[PDB]
């Protein structure tokens, strides 16, 4: 009843206050670790026909 | 001051002053969550300071100051 | 030396002597480099560079010798540390203007030190001969710029004269000194801007060039690209200081203000209550598919990226106007092209090398970094007593525990691996493998990395070189579930080779960790090798007692085969009984070996002595209901209080 | 695959004269060698991955690297698109080279290791009768 | 006993005492005349403390008997010099040395 | 022509140069014949550039024979291709030599 209504409080408190609040240098280390896994792998990569069009432009071709 | 002693005495099962992982597992498996071992080891070692591993009395009180 | 031009044998023998003055002092022989500073005698090296009548080969000789005496021991130590990017986050590191609206300003990273010893002749020569000889750089770093401007702005009329006899010996060992002078941390911004006007003008790069001189220029631009990547990565950390401090509070205070004025955890604390790294993908993965997320999309728009055009114009023009042989030129020309179209992927493969550390731990990571290259340069050489002093000073260093993802990213579980595989084509292995067993214990996921060489490590059991394989499986549970059967199968093949000993007690001590690992057995590894060891040989009451008279060899080989067979027992529950065919292995451990335990339980601890009973009592406590509480009772406890005053 | 993509017909003619003037045993020996392991969905590694799921970068089993496995056989298909009467006989009898490899027979026997595999993933799951997410994604 | 030939006269009375640093510009050669060392070459005036057993004993004793501005042509004995072991690479075993030393400053 | 036939049989094959391990003391023993020195020198130069196992046989006595060839014969650059191929192997630098 009333005794376990704080058992949900203290157990979830262990994973409450430190969530990149306690470590400073392990957070900036961890921020870029998350930054390189989601925010970096973008899709500018539509160069792949401009390049192979510009490699076959003349001898022996640059692509050949 | 004393009700957190009562929650500690409910959490303490073997009478040693250091709460191990097993009592947290046996209260968690009746609380309402289904965790992994790494998250449960974190919930004892998220407030870890020196390498004792287990949560003892004074850091449990100063953590109870940091919630209620 | 100028009259050597017409003397063919006397020129070729002094060319091939200058090759010996460089092949002898190569890869850092700092005692020999202090010895050839007496036969080569520095102020004539400054002469032989400037002289415009010296012959074709002997210009290339004295350039390639100056580099391999004074310069090319420190310049290679700034090519191992080219792809690390560990960077302090002290106060001026936030002062990077991040893209001021290759001649870089700050470059606050943590690159190695240079130290130069004055080459004299004294009686403390073991203290002197440990770094390099010195020769004055401020003279040389101004001299090679006027040596360049005299070359390109005069050579543009395309003479048939020039300095080496052709134009190869004029420009090849002038760029090669210019290249390995750039890397050494000199040529400050008053000289970088002064020298970039020679290549860019925005001209050397648009000239007519032969093949093996333009190969050296490809390695010149390929440093200029990796000077901007050092600037971009130093711009991100300048941005990721306040942005993680504007998230250490704004997330956590709303994680605290809400969880002060709430008690329970329905969703308000449950929303981010997870692993710390997995929560980092939670708060930063949402910003592209609030208030803080109005800062990234300005920056990720300005971490798009000039010289990216003039590279990708020239390196395709050079392939147009020629049929280019020497296929090291072609490959080195296209890696530099493709990097201009994929600036993202090069920026991808730097972030699993970088790291950030504070200002107070600066004072100890450089002593690690200085003592790491000494390990790393020793990879290519009684060559060992520098490694053991080096490996020990890593372990006694401060920053080896507190940043064990940095030390997983510098690669030093594979550097000490490649030292070991050289030796196993003797006293080096026992200080090599002792480093790995100290390495597996400092972190859990670090042990996961070291696991991958287990398939090699088991082929190298000498008598220690198996302790690495044991302490890679030892305490953690997932890796104990991860290994297959032919990893374990080669171990019990080798025990059949021990059908003669003492090397059986160490093969088995690995097999204890593959099956028990936490306090309770693992079920799939339980059902393996006992399914193998039926088909292997290894009465036995005659062996266990006669070894007392003979003296700890077969006394403990059978006293550890028991503790193996006790762990790979199914359960102490009705998981043992009320299951399917897990009772079949319960019968094999009591019918292939009958009990006969009276040789073990009482006679051994009455004068080795306490442990062989402790191994035998576990096999009783798993495979082997109230009358037996009385028959074996008071066994051994007669000496319990008897020797109690003999502690 | 991105060259033979629509069942190109000159490219199946360049890739056949090259197998007959520069007579390669090593190509066909590699191709039977490439389908030698190549994959199989195995449940023995799945139960440990299921048993670890009770209490703990995942999915590292998946069909034993299927992305190479579809792409190897899709490449083998496109050498016979448009009904080449010679690439359906230079994959069976192989009259040029000394030792002949029978890829058509050999590509049956890979499939037989996929029939017995995904029948056995049925039998482990034949009793529970309720789909889990990681039983969909691997099936 | 080492042969100290004076070349130029300095001032003679202000001599280096025990416990001082010696600013020397020096050029050393073998007996054959081949030059194995210098200090005009590397362009740094050498410095060392008397008595601390840093420079060799022939150089030290011959630098003792000089003054400011005086230069000397020491002809050092090989047994006071590097000896039969010599030095591996530069000095052959048991060869006499000819130093041209010159003091500039002291402490 | 007997020495050039020996030098051709080894020059490309690294495995062959390993099996020319133990015979190396006898070739350098025959080095002072002063009429067949040009055969053994080009054979030995086509050995140390190939396999690192033959680099480990050469002790202090074997080098001083090659140094002594240089005093009695003088201006021969092909001796200095051997000693250039002796103090640095394929990639590694044998710091004893
Ligand atoms: Ca406990
Ligand atoms: Ca404690």
Other C-beta atoms lying within 10 Å of the C-beta of residue C276: 18
**Closest-approach residue (CA) in chain D for C477:** D52
CB C418 within 8 A of CB C456: no
- HSE (side-chain half, CA atoms, 13 Å) at B14: 10
Q: How far apart are CA C114 and CA C362, in angstroms?
A: 17
Q: How far apart are CA E28 and CA E39, in angstroms?
A: 9
| Helix H or strand E segment including C322 | none
Buried b / exposed e over C176-209, threshold 16 CB at 10 Å, is bbbbbbbbbeebeeeeeeebeebbeeeebbeeeb
- Chain-centre distance of CA C631, in angstroms? 59
Q: How far apart are CA C437 and CA D11, in angstroms?
A: 56
| Catalytic residue (choose from E26, E50, E91, E98) | E26
Flag whether D touches E (3+ CB pairs, 8 A cutoff).
no
User: Cα–Cα distances in Å, from C373 out to C387, C391, C411, C433, D48?
Assistant: 11, 11, 12, 19, 41
**B67 at C interface, C-beta within 8 A:** yes
Query: C428, C412, C439: which is closest to C462 by C-alpha?
Result: C428
Other C-beta atoms lying within 10 Å of the C-beta of residue E99: 23
β-strand E23-29 against E97-105: which pairing, if any?
Answer: antiparallel
User: Cα–Cα distances in Å, from D51 out to B36, C523, D47, D54?
Assistant: 12, 10, 6, 6
CB F37 within 8 A of CB F69: yes
What angle, 0 to 180 degrees and rounded to 10, lies between the N-to-C axes of helices C554-567 and C540-549?
140
Contact C26 F80 (CB under 8 A): no
Contact C275 B42 (CB under 8 A): yes
- Got the DSSP string for C251-294? HHHHHHHTTT-----SSTTTTT-S-HHHHHHHHHSSS----GGG
Return all residues near C333 (Cβ < 8 A) that are at least 6 apart: C218, C315, C318, C319, C324
The length of chain B, given as a count of residues: 68
Contact D52 C524 (CB under 8 A): no
**D54 at C interface, C-beta within 8 A:** no
Compare CB distances from C381 to F76, F81, F93 and report the shortest one's residue: F93
E46 is catalytic: no
What angle, 0 to 180 degrees and rounded to 10, lies between the N-to-C axes of helices C362-377 and C412-423?
30
E100 is catalytic: no
- Chain-centre distance of CA C318, in angstroms? 38
Flag whether A touches B (3+ CB pairs, 8 A cutoff).
yes
CB C36 within 8 A of CB C69: yes
CB C75 within 8 A of CB C222: no
Q: How far apart are CA C82 and CA C373, in angstroms?
A: 12
Could you tell me the end-to-end alpha-carbon distance of chain D, in angstroms, rounded to an integer?
25
B3 phi and psi angles, rounded to 5 deg: -75, -30
Flag whether F touches C (3+ CB pairs, 8 A cutoff).
yes
Q: Three-class SS string for C473-512?
A: CCCCCHHHHHCCHHHHHHHHHHHHHCCCCCCHHHHHHHHC
Compare CB distances from C255 to A8, A16, A32 and report the shortest one's residue: A16
Q: How far apart are CA D90 and CA D76, in angstroms?
A: 12
**C477 at D interface, C-beta within 8 A:** yes
CB C97 within 8 A of CB C367: no
Q: Shortest Cα distance from C224 to chain F (angstroms)?
A: 27
Return all residues near C394 (Cβ < 8 A) that are at least 6 apart: C368, C371, C372, C375, C400, C412, C435
Buried b / exposed e over C552-571, threshold 16 CB at 10 Å, is eebbbbbbbbbbbbbbbbbb
Q: How far apart are CA C399 and CA C396, in angstroms?
A: 9
CB C515 within 8 A of CB C567: yes
Query: C90, C87, C78, C76: which is closest to C350 by C-alpha?
Result: C87
Could you tell me the end-to-end alpha-carbon distance of chain A, in angstroms, rounded to an integer?
79
- Got the DSSP string for C413-427? HHHHHHHHHHH---T
Return all residues near C124 (Cβ < 8 A) that are at least 6 apart: E54
Q: Can you say whether the dihedral through the CA atoms of C53, C54, C60, C66 is positive or negative?
A: negative
Q: How far apart are CA C279 and CA C272, in angstroms?
A: 6
**F67 at C interface, C-beta within 8 A:** no
Is B18 marked as a binding-site residue?
yes
Cα dihedral: C493, C498, C503, C509 (round 10):
40
- HSE (side-chain half, CA atoms, 13 Å) at C133: 24
Tokens of residue C181, six digits: 């002078």
Q: Which of D49, D52, D53, D56 is the mutation pick for testing B, counting most B CBs within 10 A? A: D56
E23 phi and psi angles, rounded to 5 deg: -80, 110
Contact A11 B64 (CB under 8 A): no
Cα dihedral: E48, E52, E58, E60 (round 10):
40
Instruction: C297-304: list long-range contacts, CB under 8 Å, 24+ apart.
Output: C299/C239, C300/A39, C302/C99, C303/C232, C303/C235, C303/C236
Tokens of residue B44, six digits: 């004892």
CB C22 within 8 A of CB F80: no
Residues of C in contact with B42 (CB under 8 A): 275
| Helix H or strand E segment including E101 | strand E97-105
Is B50 marked as a binding-site residue?
yes
Contact C478 D47 (CB under 8 A): no
Which residue is associated with the tokens 């950390």? Answer: C237
Q: How far apart are CA C633 and CA E97, in angstroms?
A: 91
Ranges of each domain in chain B: 1-68
Ligand nearest to the CA of residue B55, numbered in listed order: 2
Buried b / exposed e over C220-241, threshold 16 CB at 10 Å, is bbeebbeebbbbbbbbbbbbbb
Q: How far apart are CA F57 and CA F27, in angstroms?
A: 13
The length of chain F, given as a count of residues: 97
Ligand nearest to the CA of residue B15, numbered in listed order: 1
Is B34 marked as a binding-site residue?
no
Is B39 marked as a binding-site residue?
no
Q: How far apart are CA C512 and CA C566, in angstroms?
A: 10
Breaks after residues in chain A, judged by C–N over 2.5 Å: 58
Query: E26, E21, E20: which is closest to E70 by C-alpha?
Result: E26
CB F4 within 8 A of CB F41: no
Cα dihedral: D125, D127, D128, D133 (round 10):
20
Flag whether D touches C (3+ CB pairs, 8 A cutoff).
yes
Tokens of residue C563, six digits: 């503790």
Other C-beta atoms lying within 10 Å of the C-beta of residue C600: 22
Residues of C in contact with A13 (CB under 8 A): 259, 269
Strand order in the sheet with E35-37: E3-8, E71-76, E97-105, E23-29, E35-37
CB D46 within 8 A of CB D58: no
CB C54 within 8 A of CB C69: no
Contact A8 B31 (CB under 8 A): yes
Tokens of residue C157, six digits: 């009329």
User: Class assignment of domain B1-68?
Assistant: mainly alpha
**Rg over CA atoms, chain E:** 13
Instruction: C434-439: list long-range contacts, CB under 8 Å, 24+ apart.
Output: C435/C391, C435/C394, C435/C395, C436/C468, C436/C471, C437/C467, C437/C468, C437/C471, C438/C395, C439/C413
CB E83 within 8 A of CB E57: no
CB C263 within 8 A of CB A54: no
CB C104 within 8 A of CB C359: no
Q: Which residues of C touch F (CB under 8 A)?
A: 9-10, 12-13, 15-17, 19-20, 23-24, 26-27, 29, 380-381, 383
**B9 at A interface, C-beta within 8 A:** no
What resolution does the deposited structure have, in angstroms? 3.7
E15 is catalytic: no
Residues of C in contact with E35 (CB under 8 A): 41
Return all residues near C440 (Cβ < 8 A) that are at least 6 apart: C446, C447, C450, C468, C471, C472, C474
Which chains pack against C, by 3+ Cβ pairs within 8 A? A, B, D, E, F
| Helix H or strand E segment including E49 | none
**A20 at C interface, C-beta within 8 A:** yes
Ligand nearest to the CA of residue B12, numbered in listed order: 1
Q: How far apart are CA C29 and CA C33, in angstroms?
A: 6
Compare CB distances from C123 to E41, E56, E89 and report the shortest one's residue: E56
Contact D56 C477 (CB under 8 A): yes
C478 phi and psi angles, rounded to 5 deg: -70, -40
- HSE (side-chain half, CA atoms, 13 Å) at D117: 19
Query: D30, D6, D20, D18: which is closest to D78 by C-alpha?
Result: D6
Q: How far apart are CA C246 and CA C293, in angstroms?
A: 11
Q: How far apart are CA C97 and CA C113, in angstroms?
A: 26
Distance B54 CA to ligand 2 centre (A): 6
Which chains pack against F, by 3+ Cβ pairs within 8 A? C
E102 phi and psi angles, rounded to 5 deg: -150, 120
Q: Is C449 helix (H, G, I), strand (E, B) or coil?
A: helix
User: Cα–Cα distances in Å, from A39 out to C300, C344, C355, D92, E92?
Assistant: 8, 11, 18, 50, 67
**Closest-approach residue (CA) in chain B for C259:** B67
Is B48 marked as a binding-site residue?
yes
Distance B21 CA to ligand 1 centre (A): 7
CB D2 within 8 A of CB A52: no
Return all residues near C641 (Cβ < 8 A) that are at least 6 apart: none
User: Cα–Cα distances in Å, from C6 out to C2, C44, C198?
Assistant: 9, 22, 35
**D47 at C interface, C-beta within 8 A:** yes
**Closest-approach residue (CA) in chain E for C117:** E42
Residue C112: left (phi > 0), alpha (psi -120 to 50), or beta? beta
Q: How far apart are CA C165 and CA C178, in angstroms?
A: 20
User: Cα–Cα distances in Å, from E91 out to C31, C112, E35, E79, F64?
Assistant: 14, 35, 11, 13, 19
Please report the residues numbered 27 through 56 in chain B whose beta carbons come closer than 8 angstroms to any beta carbon of chain D.
Answer: 35-38
| Helix H or strand E segment including C113 | none
Q: How far apart are CA D16 and CA D8, in angstroms?
A: 13
CB C558 within 8 A of CB C543: yes
Q: How far apart are CA D12 and CA D19, in angstroms?
A: 11
CB E10 within 8 A of CB E66: yes
CB F7 within 8 A of CB F16: no
Residue B62: left (phi > 0), alpha (psi -120 to 50), or beta? alpha
Buried b / exposed e over C418-442, threshold 16 CB at 10 Å, is ebbeeeeeeebbeebbbbbbebbee
Tokens of residue C409, six digits: 């990213």
| C59 burial type by CB count under 10 A (0-12 exposed, 13-18 middle, 19+ buried) | buried
Query: C27, C624, C5: which is closest to C373 by C-alpha?
Result: C27
Tokens of residue C3, six digits: 């009259």
Is B14 marked as a binding-site residue?
yes
E99 is catalytic: yes
Instruction: C537-544: list long-range contacts, CB under 8 Å, 24+ apart.
Output: C537/C496, C537/C499, C538/C495, C538/C496, C538/C498, C538/C499, C538/C504, C539/C596, C540/C593, C540/C596, C541/C596, C541/C598, C541/C599, C544/C599, C544/C600
Eight-class DSSP state of C145:
H
Which residue is associated with the tokens 């006027």? Answer: C146
| Catalytic residue (choose from E4, E15, E56, E100) | E56
Distance B19 CA to ligand 2 centre (A): 9
Q: How far apart are CA C483 and CA C486, in angstroms?
A: 9
Tokens of residue C632, six digits: 């074996």
CB C457 within 8 A of CB C469: yes
Q: How far apart are CA C446 and CA C451, in angstroms?
A: 9
Ligand nearest to the CA of residue B54, numbered in listed order: 2
């Amino acid at each position: 009843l009333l005794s376990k209504q704080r058992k949900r409080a203290v157990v979830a408190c262990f994973r409450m206050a430190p969530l990149y609040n306690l470590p400073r240098h392990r957070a900036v280390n961890l921020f870029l670790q998350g930054y390189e896994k989601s925010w970096i792998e973008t899709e500018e990569h539509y160069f792949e026909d401009k390049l192979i069009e510009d490699l076959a432009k003349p001898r022996v071709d640059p692509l050949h | 001051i004393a009700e957190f002693k009562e929650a500690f005495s409910l959490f303490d099962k073997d009478g040693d002053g250091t709460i191990t992982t097993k009592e947290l597992g046996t209260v968690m498996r009746s609380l309402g969550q289904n965790p992994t071992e790494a998250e449960l080891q974190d919930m004892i070692n998220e407030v870890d300071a020196d390498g004792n591993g287990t949560i003892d009395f004074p850091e449990f009180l100063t953590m109870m100051a940091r919630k209620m | 030396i100028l009259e050597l031009t017409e003397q063919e044998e006397l020129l070729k023998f002094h060319y091939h002597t200058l090759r010996l003055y460089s092949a002898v002092c190569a890869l850092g022989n700092h005692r020999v480099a202090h010895a050839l500073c007496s036969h080569v005698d520095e102020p004539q090296l400054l002469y032989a560079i400037e002289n415009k009548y010296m012959p074709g080969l002997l210009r290339a000789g004295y350039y390639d010798l100056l580099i391999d005496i004074h310069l090319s021991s420190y310049a290679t130590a700034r090519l191992m540390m080219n792809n690390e990017f560990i960077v302090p986050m002290t106060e001026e590191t936030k002062s990077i203007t991040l893209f001021p609206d290759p001649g870089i300003g700050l470059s606050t990273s943590l690159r190695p030190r240079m130290q130069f010893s004055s080459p004299s002749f004294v009686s403390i020569n073991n203290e002197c001969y440990q770094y390099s000889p010195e020769f004055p750089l401020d003279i040389l770093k101004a001299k090679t710029i006027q040596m360049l401007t005299e070359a390109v702005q005069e050579g543009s009329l395309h003479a048939r004269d020039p300095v080496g006899g052709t134009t190869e010996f004029l420009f090849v060992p002038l760029i090669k000194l210019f290249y390995t002078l750039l890397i050494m941390g000199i040529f400050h911004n008053e000289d970088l801007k002064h020298i970039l006007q020679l290549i860019e003008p925005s001209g050397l790069l648009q000239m007519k060039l032969p093949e093996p001189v333009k190969l050296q220029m490809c390695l010149l631009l390929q440093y200029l690209c990796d000077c901007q990547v050092r600037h971009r990565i130093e711009a991100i950390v300048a941005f990721s200081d306040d942005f993680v401090a504007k998230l250490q509070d704004n997330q956590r205070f709303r994680y605290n203000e809400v969880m002060q004025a709430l008690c329970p955890c329905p969703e308000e604390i449950r929303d981010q209550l997870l692993d710390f790294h997995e929560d980092l993908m939670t708060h930063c993965g949402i910003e592209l598919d609030l208030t803080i997320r109005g800062r990234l999309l300005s920056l990720v728009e300005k971490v798009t990226y000039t010289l990216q055009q003039l590279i990708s114009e020239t390196m395709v023009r050079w392939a147009q106007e020629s049929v280019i042989e020497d296929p090291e030129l072609v490959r080195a020309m296209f890696v530099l092209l493709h990097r201009q179209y994929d600036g993202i992927g090069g920026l991808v493969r730097a972030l699993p090398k970088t790291y950030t550390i504070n200002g107070v731990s600066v004072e100890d990571t450089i002593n690690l970094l200085a003592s790491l290259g000494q390990i790393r340069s020793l990879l290519s050489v009684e060559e060992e007593k520098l490694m053991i002093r080096g490996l020990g000073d890593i372990m006694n260093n401060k920053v080896f525990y507190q940043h064990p993802n940095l030390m997983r990213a510098l690669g030093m579980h594979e550097t000490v691996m490649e030292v070991m595989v050289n030796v196993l084509g003797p006293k080096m292995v026992a200080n090599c493998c002792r480093f790995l067993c100290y390495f597996c214990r400092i972190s859990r996921q670090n042990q996961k990395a070291m696991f991958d060489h287990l398939s090699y490590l088991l082929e190298n059991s000498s008598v220690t070189p198996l302790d690495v394989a044991a302490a890679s499986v030892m305490d953690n549970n997932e890796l104990a579930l991860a290994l297959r059967e032919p990893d374990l199968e080669k171990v019990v093949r080798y025990l059949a080779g021990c059908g003669l000993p003492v090397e059986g007690e160490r093969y088995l001590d690995f097999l204890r960790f593959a099956v028990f690992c936490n306090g309770e057995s693992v079920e799939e590894n339980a059902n393996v090798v006992v399914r193998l060891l039926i088909r292997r040989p290894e009465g036995l009451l005659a062996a266990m007692e006669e070894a007392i008279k003979i003296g700890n060899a077969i006394m403990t080989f059978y006293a550890a085969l028991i503790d193996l067979l006790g762990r790979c027992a199914p359960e102490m529950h009705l998981i043992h009984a009320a299951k399917g065919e897990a009772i079949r292995i319960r019968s094999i451990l009591r019918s292939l070996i009958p009990l006969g335990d009276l040789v073990g339980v009482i006679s051994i601890a009455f004068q080795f002595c306490p442990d062989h009973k402790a191994a035998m009592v576990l096999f009783l406590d798993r495979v082997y209901v109230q009358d037996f509480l009385l028959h074996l009772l008071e066994v051994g406890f007669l000496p319990d209080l008897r020797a109690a005053a003999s502690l | 695959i991105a060259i033979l993509n629509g069942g190109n017909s000159t490219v199946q003619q360049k890739m056949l004269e090259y197998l007959k003037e520069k007579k390669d045993v090593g190509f066909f020996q590699s191709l039977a060698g490439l389908m030698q392991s190549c994959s199989v969905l195995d449940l023995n590694a799945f139960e440990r991955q299921n048993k670890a799921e009770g209490l703990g970068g995942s999915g590292e089993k998946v069909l034993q690297d299927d992305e190479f496995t579809c792409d190897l056989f899709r490449f083998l298909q496109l050498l016979c698109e448009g009904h080449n009467s010679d690439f359906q006989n230079y994959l069976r009898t192989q009259t040029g080279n000394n030792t002949t490899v029978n890829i058509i027979i050999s590509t049956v026997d890979y499939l037989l290791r996929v029939q017995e595999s995904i029948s056995d993933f049925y039998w482990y799951y034949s009793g529970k009768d309720v789909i889990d997410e990681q039983g969909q994604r691997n099936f | 006993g080492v042969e100290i030939e004076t070349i130029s006269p300095g001032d003679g009375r202000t001599f280096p005492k025990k416990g001082q640093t010696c600013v020397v510009h020096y050029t050393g050669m073998l007996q054959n005349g081949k030059k194995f060392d210098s200090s005009r070459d590397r362009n740094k005036p050498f410095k060392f403390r008397i008595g601390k057993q840093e420079v060799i004993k022939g150089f030290e004793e011959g630098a003792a008997q000089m003054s400011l501005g005086q230069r000397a042509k020491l002809t050092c004995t090989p047994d006071v010099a590097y000896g039969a072991t010599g030095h591996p690479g530069v000095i052959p075993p048991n060869a006499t040395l000819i130093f041209d030393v010159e003091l500039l400053n002291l402490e | 022509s007997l020495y050039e036939l020996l030098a051709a049989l080894i020059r490309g094959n690294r495995k062959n140069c390993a099996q020319f391990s133990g015979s190396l003391d006898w070739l350098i023993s025959r080095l002072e014949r002063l009429e067949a020195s040009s055969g053994i020198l080009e054979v030995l130069h086509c050995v140390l550039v190939e396999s690192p196992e033959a680099l480990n046989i050469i002790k202090e006595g074997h080098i001083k024979s090659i140094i002594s060839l240089l005093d009695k014969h003088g201006r021969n650059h092909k001796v200095l291709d051997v000693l250039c191929s002796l103090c640095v192997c394929h990639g590694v630098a044998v710091r004893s030599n």
